[PDB]
């Protein structure tokens, strides 16, 4: 039923051919998963500004790893925030009828 320990290794081999790096993006979800500041799944989409080859390098090196992920937390928290595009508080509800 429910997923216990969301593993990234087995997660990869847990999806069809082309569904390789489909789920956990390239390699950021695994890295962000480690931190989980804002949202691993969504954070990944943002860091995805680089080549799949760069994210691999960072994943094998904390130096570049945190470099990109860390930034994510700052940027995304700012850019990737709550969509304030909601309705106005001055919305007429009561219709002045007879």
């Amino acid at each position: 039923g429910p997923l216990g320990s969301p593993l990234t290794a087995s997660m990869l081999a847990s999806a069809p051919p082309q569904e390789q790096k489909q789920m956990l993006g390239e390699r950021l979800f695994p890295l962000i998963q480690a931190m989980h500041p804002t949202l691993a799944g969504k954070i990944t989409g943002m860091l995805l500004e680089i080549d799949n080859s760069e994210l691999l390098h960072m994943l094998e090196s904390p130096e570049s790893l945190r470099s990109k992920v860390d930034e994510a937390v700052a940027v995304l928290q700012a850019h990737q925030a709550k969509e304030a595009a909601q309705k106005a508080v001055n919305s007429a509800t009561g219709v002045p009828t007879v």
Binding site: Q18, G25, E26, L48
Partner: peptide, 22 residues
């Protein structure tokens, strides 16, 4: 001080290694 980061808020997260070439 409102400087951008290394990993901006790029698009969504898709299959990076989409190696579906047969």
């Amino acid at each position: 001080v409102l400087m951008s980061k290394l990993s901006v808020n790029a698009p969504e997260f898709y299959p990076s290694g989409y190696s579906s070439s047969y």
